[PDB]
Structure formats: C-alpha cells, structure tokens
Amino acid sequence: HSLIPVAKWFVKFITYLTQEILILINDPTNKEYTLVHGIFGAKMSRTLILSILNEIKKVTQIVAKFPETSYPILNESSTFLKLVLSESPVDFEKFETFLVDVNNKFIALCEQQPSQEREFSLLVKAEIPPEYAKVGDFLLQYANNAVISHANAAAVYFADTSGLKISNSEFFNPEIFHLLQPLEEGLIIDTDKLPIKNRTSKSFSKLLYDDVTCDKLSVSEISDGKLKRCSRCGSVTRAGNIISSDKTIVPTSIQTKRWPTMYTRLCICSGMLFEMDG
Amino acid sequence: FRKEELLLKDLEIRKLEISSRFKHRQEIFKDSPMDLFMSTLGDCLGIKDEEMLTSCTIPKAVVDHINGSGKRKPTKAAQRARDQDSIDISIKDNKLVMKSKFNKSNRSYSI
Amino acid sequence: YKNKLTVCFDDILKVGAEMMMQQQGFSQSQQKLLKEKVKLFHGILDDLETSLSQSSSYLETLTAL
Amino acid sequence: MQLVVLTDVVERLHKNFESENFKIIALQPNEISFKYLSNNDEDDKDCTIKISTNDDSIKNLTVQLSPSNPQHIIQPFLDNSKMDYHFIFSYLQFTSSLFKALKVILNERGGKFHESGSQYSTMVNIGLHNLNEYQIVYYNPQAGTKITICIELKTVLHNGRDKIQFHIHFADVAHITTKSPAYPMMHQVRNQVFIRLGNGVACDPSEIEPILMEIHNILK
Amino acid sequence: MDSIIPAGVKLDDLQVILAKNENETRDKVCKQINEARDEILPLRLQFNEFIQIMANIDQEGSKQADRMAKYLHIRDKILQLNDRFQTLSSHLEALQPLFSTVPEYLKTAD
Numbered sequence: 001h002s003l004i005p006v007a008k009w010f011v012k013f014i015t016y017l018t019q020e021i022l023i024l025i026n027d028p029t030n031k032e033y034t035l036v037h038g039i040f041g042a043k044m045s046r047t048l049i050l051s052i053l054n055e056i057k058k059v060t061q062i063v064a065k066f067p068e069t070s071y072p073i074l075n076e077s078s079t080f081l082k083l084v085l086s087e088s089p090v091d092f093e094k095f096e097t098f099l100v101d102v103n104n105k106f107i108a109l110c111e112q113q114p115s116q117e118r119e120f121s122l123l124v125k126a127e128i129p130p131e132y133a134k135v136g137d138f139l140l141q142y143a144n145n146a147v148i149s150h151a152n153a154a155a156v157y158f159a160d161t162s163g164l165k166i167s168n169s170e171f172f173n174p175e176i177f178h179l180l181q182p183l184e185e186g187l188i189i190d191t192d193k194l195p196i197k198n199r200t201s202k203s204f205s206k207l208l209y210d211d212v213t214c215d216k217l218s219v220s221e222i223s224d225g226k227l228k229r230c231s232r233c234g235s236v237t238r239a240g241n242i243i244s245s246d247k248t249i250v251p252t253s254i255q256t257k258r259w260p261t262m263y264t265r266l267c268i269c270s271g272m273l274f275e276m277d278g
Numbered sequence: 279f280r281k282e283e284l285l286l287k288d289l290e291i292r293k294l295e296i297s298s299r300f301k302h303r304q305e306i307f308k309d310s311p312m313d314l315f316m317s318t319l320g321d322c323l324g325i326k327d328e329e330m331l332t333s334c335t336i337p338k339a340v341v342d343h344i345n346g347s348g349k350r351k352p353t354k355a356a357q358r359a360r361d362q363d364s365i366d367i368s369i370k371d372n373k374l375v376m377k378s379k380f381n382k383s384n385r386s387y388s389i
Numbered sequence: 390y391k392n393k394l395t396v397c398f399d400d401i402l403k404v405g406a407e408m409m410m411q412q413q414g415f416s417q418s419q420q421k422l423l424k425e426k427v428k429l430f431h432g433i434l435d436d437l438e439t440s441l442s443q444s445s446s447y448l449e450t451l452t453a454l
Numbered sequence: 455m456q457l458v459v460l461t462d463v464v465e466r467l468h469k470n471f472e473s474e475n476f477k478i479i480a481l482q483p484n485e486i487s488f489k490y491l492s493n494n495d496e497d498d499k500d501c502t503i504k505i506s507t508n509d510d511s512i513k514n515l516t517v518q519l520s521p522s523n524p525q526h527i528i529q530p531f532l533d534n535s536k537m538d539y540h541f542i543f544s545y546l547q548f549t550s551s552l553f554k555a556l557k558v559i560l561n562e563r564g565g566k567f568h569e570s571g572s573q574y575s576t577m578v579n580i581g582l583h584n585l586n587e588y589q590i591v592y593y594n595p596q597a598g599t600k601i602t603i604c605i606e607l608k609t610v611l612h613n614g615r616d617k618i619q620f621h622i623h624f625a626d627v628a629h630i631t632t633k634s635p636a637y638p639m640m641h642q643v644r645n646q647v648f649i650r651l652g653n654g655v656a657c658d659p660s661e662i663e664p665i666l667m668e669i670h671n672i673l674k
Numbered sequence: 675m676d677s678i679i680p681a682g683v684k685l686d687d688l689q690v691i692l693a694k695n696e697n698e699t700r701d702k703v704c705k706q707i708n709e710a711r712d713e714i715l716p717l718r719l720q721f722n723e724f725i726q727i728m729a730n731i732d733q734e735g736s737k738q739a740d741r742m743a744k745y746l747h748i749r750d751k752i753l754q755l756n757d758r759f760q761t762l763s764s765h766l767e768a769l770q771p772l773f774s775t776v777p778e779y780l781k782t783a784d
Contacts, residue, residue, distance in 0.1 A: 019611075022651050032613075073289045087417065153651050154623075162611045170614055250285070300413060311402050316749055318413055323741050389412070391763060398755070425626075427725065428583070431718070435581050438714050439593065444773060445707045451779075452692060452700060534719050584722060 001077040001249045002213060002258060004084070009164070009214035011088050016161045018090060021143045022153065028140055037139065038126025043106070043119070046099040053096050060085070077249065089159065090151045098147045109135065165209060171234045172205055173198070201229055201277055211235040211268065212260055220244060225278045232271030239273070240264035291364075291380060298365045299376075306374075310334050324387040327376050341369045390437050397430045456483055456507045463503075463512070463539075470543045473550075491523065491550060498522060501546070515539045517546075524557035531585050545585070551663045552605070552620065556580070556590070559670060576601070599636035602628065603669075610656060620662055622669075623654040643672055675764075678702070679771035685778050703772060710765055717758065724751060 020036040039045065060082060068075050085092060110118075121127055128136045148156075163170075169177060176198050180189055197203055207227075210217055217238070221227065227238040239260030245251040267273050300318070307313045313334060320330050345368055346352025360367070368375055378385055404426050408419045463486075467476075471490055479499055480487035486503035493500055502518035516533065519526040525546075532542065563578050575596035581589035592601035606621040624644075630637050647669065649656045657665055678699050679688065692699070727748065735741060 023649075026649055071286055073286050073293075154653055157651055157654070157656075158608050158610055160609075160611065160616075162614065162616060167614055250282075252282075296413060300410065311399055311406075312749075312752065314406075315402055316745070318409060319745065322409065322413060323738070323745070391766065394759065394762075398759070430721075431583050432581075434714070434718060435591075438711070439579070441707065441710060441714075443595070444776065447776065448703065448707075448772070451689075530715055530719070 004077070004080060005210075005213050005215035007081075007084055011084070012161055012164060014095060015089065015156060015159055016164060016166075018095075018147070018151075019156055019159065019161060021148065022157055025140055025144060028137075035126055037128055037136065038122060038124075040099070040102055040139065041106070041122025041126070041128075043103070043122065046103050049099060050096065053092060056085070056092075074249070089155055090147065094147045094150045098143070101142075101146070105138070163209060165206075165211070168234075170206065173203060176204065205229065205234045205236055207236055211237045212239045212263055215247075218246075220246075225276065227276050228273040229276045230267035230269065230271045230273055232267065233269045235267060235269070236276070237263065237267075237273070288380065294364055295378075298363060302365070302367065306336075306340075321387055322389060324385075327374055332372065335372055336369065341372075344368055390433070390440075393433055394437075397426070397433070401426050401430070455509070456505070459507060459512050460486075460505070463515070466540060467543060470540060471547055473547070490546075492554060493523070495522075501525075515542075517542060523553075524560065525553050527580055527582060528585070528588075531582070535585065537585075548618075548659055549588075551659050552588070552666075555663045555666045555670075556588075558667070559590075562674060594636070597636060599634070601636070601640070608656070619656040620659065621654055621656055622662075622666070639672070643669065646672065675768070677771070679774075681771060685775045685782075688775060703769065706765060706769060710762070713758075713762065720751075724748070724755075727751075 017036060017039055020033060024030070024033055024036060063078050063081065068078060106122075117129065118132065121129060165171060175195065180193070191199060207222055208217060209215075217227075221238055221244065226241045227236060228240070229236050237260075240263060241260070242255050243258060245253065248256075263273065265273060299321075303314060303317065307317065310333070313332060317330070342348045342350070343352075343356075346356070366377070366379070401423070404419065404422050408415065408423070464478075467488075473490060475492055476488070476490045478486075478488040479497060482505075484505050486501075486505060487499035488503075489498075489500045491500040499520055500523050502520070504516045504518060506513040506516070514536075517529075519529055559578060560580075563574075575594045577593045579591065579593060581591050581602075583589060587604060587606040589605065590603045594600070602625050603622065604625050607618050608621045609616045609618050624640070628640065630640055632641070634640075647655060655665075735744070
C-alpha cells in the first residue's frame with residue numbers, strides 16, 4: 001500500500017520529459033530547455049529505468065501468479081498496482097522501447113568516432129558538443145514518431161506535472177531565494193541578519209510535499225513536529241517515524257515500522273537529517 | 279485477534295449485501311432512472327427506506343408474490359430461493375424494507 | 390430532436406450510473422464520457438436554436454412573399 | 455461615498471487596464487461610460503458599468519456592452535454569474551484582441567451589398583458554452599457541412615508556473631476523413647498550421663489577432 | 675392546444691388561409707418563437723448551475739439534515755427540468771404543423 005504514493009511521482013516524472021519532447025520540436029534553438037538532452041544521454045539511467053520496468057513486470061507477474069486469497073478485502077492494494085500501470089496516460093511498453101533504441105544508437109556512434117568527453121557531456125554537462133551538432137538533430141526527429149504516436153498528444157501537453165520539486169526555486173521560499181550579502185562580506189551568513197519572518201527553519205522551505213515516499217503532507221503531520229529537514233539540499237521528510245492511522249490500509253492503533261526507517265539519520269543526498277524545530 | 283477478523287468479515291458481508299442490493303435495485307426500478315438515482319444516492323447517504331419518498335407507484339402483484347400471504351401460497355422453490363439470497367426483501371405499502379442481519383445498530387453508509 | 394433531448398438527460402444519469410456504481414477515486418474514462426456528454430448536450434442545444442432561427446426567418450420571408 | 459468608490463474603481467482599472475485605448479467618455483453617478491477598445495466613434499461607450507452604491511461600497515457592478523461592441527454576446531453570462539469585478543476586468547483585457555478579431559470576422563460577412571453576386575453559402579455565427587470558452591461554427595445549409603472552431607481557456611505548465619492560453623483547435627469530433635466534400639479546406643488548414651502539437655494551437659493573446667487572421671486568410 | 679393549422683392540408687391552401695384574418699396566427703407564432711428563444715438561454719444557465727452544484731457536493735456539508743434539504747432541492751430541480759421538457763415538447767408540437775410545410779416546399783423546389 002505504501003508504494004502507491006511513490007508510484008504517483010514515478011508516473012508524474014516520465015510525463016515531464018515526454019512533455020518537453022513536444023515543446024522542443026517547435027523551437028530547437030531554445031537553450032533554456034537543454035536539460036532534456038542530458039537525461040536521455042545518461043547511459044545507466046536508460047538501463048536503470050529498464051531494470052525498474054523489468055522488476056515492475058516481475059512484481060506484477062508474481063502478484064498475478066501469487067495473489068492474495070485468504071482476505072479479498074486486502075486485494076485492493078494489489079489490484080490498484082495493476083490499475084495505475086494500465087491507466088497511465090502513456091504506455092510503459094512503448095516508453096520502454098524508447099530508451100532501448102537510444103542506447104543502441106549511442107553505442108554505434110562511439111565506434112564511428114572515439115571520444116570520451118561525450119560520456120561526461122551526456123551525464124553531467126547535459127549538453128551535446130558543437131562538433132556533434134548532427135547528433136542533436138536526431139533526438140528531435142526520432143522521438144516524435146516513436147512513442148507519441150501511441151499516446152494522447154493533447155492530454156500530455158496540458159497535463160498537470162507541476163510540483164515535481166525538481167528545481168531549487170520551488171524548494172526554498174521566494175522571500176530568501178536570492179543573494180543576501182555582497183561577496184566581499186563572505187558566503188556564510190549569521191542568523192541575526194535574516195528577516196524576522198525568515199529566522200526559523202520552518203519558513204526556509206516549502207512544507208507541502210514529502211520527499212521519500214512522495215506523498216502529500218497533511219496538517220496533522222505538519223504540526224506534530226515529528227518531521228525532519230536535510231541540512232544540505234533543504235529537503236523535508238517525515239521518514240523514520242510511525243505513520244498515522246489514516247495513512248494505513250485500515251485505521252488502527254497497531255504500530256508498524258515502515259521502510260522510511262532506513263533514512264532516520266541519513267538523507268537522500270547523504271546529508272544529515274535533524275528534528276525540525278517548532 | 280478477533281477484532282480484525284470480525285471487521286473483515288463485516289466488510290465482506292457488506293460488499294456482498296451491496297452486490298445483491300444493486301442487482302435487485304436495477305431490476306425493481308428499471309423504469310424510473312430518477313427513482314434509481316435518488317434511491318442509490320440516499321442509501322449512499324445512509325437514509326432508511328421508510329423516510330425517503332417515491333414519485334412513482336409500484337404494482338401490487340410483485341408485493342403479493344414476494345410475501346405470498348395472499349390467496350396464492352408462496353412456492354417452496356421460491357422459499358428456497360429467498361433462503362439462499364443474502365437479503366430479506368419485502369415491500370410494505372409501496373415501500374420496501376432493508377435491515378442488516380448481523381449488525382442491528384445504525385450502520386452509517388455515508389462516505 | 391425530441392428524442393435527443395430526452396435521451397441526453399437520461400444518458401447523463403446513465404453515464405453517472407456506473408460512476409456511482411463504483412462509489413456504491415474516479416475513472417478517467419467515465420470523466421471524459423461525462424465531459425463529452427455535457428459538451429454534446431450544449432452543442433445540440435445550440436444546433437436546435439440555430440434551426441429554430443432559420444425556420445423562423447423562412448417563416449417571415451414566405452409570409453411576406 | 456459614491457465618489458470615493460468610483461475613484462477606487464478607476465484606480466483599480468488603471469492598475470488593470472494599462473492600454474493606449476483606455477479612456478473615459480461620460481461620467482455619471484449611476485453609470486460608467488468608458489472606452490477601452492479601438493472603436494472610432496467618440497460618444498459610443500464600448501463598456502457600460504452601472505453603479506449601484508450602498509452605505510459603504512457598490513452593491514453590484516453590472517457590466518453592460520454596446521450592441522455595436524462585439525462583446526455583447528457574453529452579457530447574460532456576466533449578468534447571471536457573481537464573479538469578482540477584478541477578474542471580469544482581467545478577462546476583458548485578456549480577450550479584447552480576440553473580440554476585435556472576431557469583430558473583423560463578423561463584419562466581413564456583415565458588409566452591405568457590394569454589387570457582387572457572391573452569395574456565399576457559409577455564414578459565421580458565435581456558439582457559446584460558458585465563460586471559459588467561445589466557439590465559432592460555420593453554417594453551410596447548401597453544402598450541408600459544418601466548420602467548428604473552439605477556443606477554450608486551458609492551463610499549461612510553463613517553467614514551473616501555470617499559464618492560461620487560448621486553445622484554438624478543431625474538436626475531437628472533427629476526425630474528418632478524406633471522403634468529405636468540404637474536407638479540402640480543413641485539410642489545407644491542418645497542413646498549413648498543425649505552438650502546434652498536431653491538433654491544438656495555444657497562442658499568446660498579444661499574438662492571437664495576427665495568427666487568427668492567418669487562419670482567416672485561408673477562410674477569406 | 676388549439677390546432678390553428680389543420681393536419682394534412684397542402685402548402686398552397688395554408689398560404690391562402692394565412693393571407694387573410696389580419697395575421698392573428700402570425701402574432702401567435704411570433705410570440706411562441708420569441709418565448710422559445712427567451713427560454714433557450716435560462717435552460718442552459720440553470721443546467722450549468724446544476725452541474726456546479728453536482729461538482730461542489732463535497733463542500734458546505736456538515737449536518738445530515740443539510741443533505742436532506744440539498745437533495746430534496748436537487749430532486750425538485752430535475753422535477754422542473756422534466757416539466758420544462760414537457761412544456762418545450764408542447765411548444766414544438768404546436769409549431770409542428772407549421773414546420774410540416776418546410777419539407778414539402780423543399781422537396782417541391784428540388
């Protein structure tokens with residue numbers, strides 16, 4: 001049951017990259033949307049998603065092979081897992097072949113001309129060197145006919161993929177998201193110089209969504225003071241604590257240690273997690 | 279741990295009761311989409327059938343046959359059929375009656 | 390047009406019939422079915438209005454002629 | 455109190471109607487006669503706002519539009535809906551260019567006798583669903599064909615922010631095959647137009663009026 | 675109600691009848707088409723209001739009697755909806771004999 005909130009962000013993520021495909025075709029000269037090139041260029045990411053799609057098929061096959069029979073009421077979580085995959089706006093099988101074909105084309109190009117900077121460019125720079133300008137044109141042309149032909153073009157463009165918490169501008173509050181002191185004064189800032197409403201860790205970030213299980217944060221979980229913040233990336237998560245009964249399959253007082261207990265002390269970015277002050 | 283067992287048993291009984299409920303409802307009031315809509319919506323609210331009002335009048339033949347207390351005796355096959363069904367169904371004065379057989383308390387059906 | 394207006398309001402309840410059946414989240418197919426039903430109801434209302442206006446104009450022009 | 459509320463309304467309009475065509479023609483205690491469109495007539499009020507004042511503020515700001523003004527077709531929806539006056543002003547300023555373009559389109563057909571026997575079988579009329587969309591359908595009784603162009607207000611995510619743009623496109627019913635006698639012109643429009651994703655065309659209101667005429671150039 | 679236009683009568687006979695009587699039937703049919711045009715819009719407005727009520731069912735509800743009142747109100751709403759459907763059916767069937775001449779005129783002019 002607890003995997004369902006994670007899967008919502010999993011589907012919400014693949015739609016953002018597919019949305020950028022349609023936008024980039026009309027205007028290939030827009031430099032502000034060059035992030036789409038690097039994401040597909042990463043070599044392990046294409047394999048990593050394929051592995052995720054592989055285990056998703058294995059899990060669904062195993063669940064179909066070994067369903068829950070003693071209690072039909074408990075089949076909702078298993079059934080919902082099948083439904084969310086089928087009801088996705090873009091078919092996973094069509095998207096699976098999309099990344100597979102990119103890997104093969106990007107391997108033959110290495111044999112055509114030996115180069116090691118392109119591996120760095122596709123992973124870190126998220127750009128294509130000017131000497132390989134012909135390679136960039138291939139991504140625009142081929143992506144249109146491959147997967148979009150089996151999906152709703154109108155729906156994906158207007159789909160609500162906002163709130164992915166990808167950019168830093170939507171992590172910290174807009175009041176403090178700017179340089180506060182000149183470079184001569186240094187980079188570290190004493191707390192006393194912060195604005196009065198911005199002198200606490202509660203006002204530093206957007207405390208709306210969770211970062212580990214990708215679930216919406218209710219008012220009860222905000223006010224209990226049991227949530228944690230990462231001192232490195234500004235992430236906020238209530239991991240490592242017992243979840244409320246309303247988030248369980250059935251409201252009950254039984255305490256179960258959920259998987260968020262892995263990140264009790266270490267954040268996702270190897271940063272330290274601390275109890276958020278109230 | 280009998281508490282969770284009885285909760286899940288009650289849930290299964292509820293879902294089978296709802297199944298019988300809508301399969302009977304879709305045929306008893308097939309002629310009136312308004313009546314079906316308002317009846318199912320009121321039962322989603324949790325309204326007892328004795329309070330809500332009906333715009334149309336049902337025939338009395340089904341009322342006589344469902345109980346059989348009239349001149350025509352109920353069929354023994356009909357008795358077995360109403361025994362195998364999970365809901366006791368009968369109509370009194372142009373209105374049917376619905377009562378839970380396991381829980382006699384005010385079972386709220388509201389969402 | 391007489392039957393279309395009757396069935397459309399019967400179908401909007403029929404389209405919802407399966408919507409509250411599961412209720413008795415929401416499926417995207419049922420939501421888009423409701424959307425197309427309401428938009429076609431509006432469209433046929435507009436078409437009937439245009440037909441009425443054209444028939445009326447024909448009425449005055451034939452009466453004058 | 456009437457003058458103070460009128461001054462507040464004027465200040466809010468100036469904050470929300472920063473355009474070169476904004477002007478006030480007649481000032482009255484019970485009604486407002488101001489011009490914000492490109493109408494040449496000096497005394498013709500493009501928008502009429504009736505003043506119903508209470509002990510503290512205006513009870514209701516009813517928007518009335520001149521019959522010559524092409525915006526008069528949205529009058530009943532404004533009348534029956536109690537929306538924010540600032541939101542109404544924002545919608546008017548956002549759709550003024552669309553109103554001017556559709557005014558040109560309707561005046562093309564509404565021209566008087568030009569001594570030409572070109573009795574076109576296509577008539578242009580405005581279809582209306584609600585305040586969120588405005589629809590144009592071309593009636594051809596001679597050919598028995600329809601040309602529907604729907605313009606909805608759909609929100610799209612842009613750089614982490616949601617924006618509202620005019621969704622000028624052909625409806626999903628317009629899955630017209632190659633066999634239709636009138637299909638040539640829809641197919642020409644599709645080939646020469648279809649931000650284009652194949653069906654929809656989202657456009658900036660500052661640029662809708664040239665592009666719509668580009669669509670209308672094929673139509674005319 | 676009243677059948678001003680007899681059934682089964684030809685178009686030319688109707689023209690001859692219409693040419694006289696100082697257009698009392700013209701006034702009646704003009705009033706009928708005017709009220710139909712003035713009825714078209716309020717039906718759309720109230721239908722949109724019903725859609726808004728249905729969409730906002732999960733708001734402004736805290737007491738069970740509130741549900742009683744609201745759903746009795748909506749059942750009454752569709753009650754006058756069916757009543758208005760019957761009234762517009764009567765209006766269109768009243769103009770049905772008048773519209774019956776249009777197919778004959780079109781087929782003769784073909």
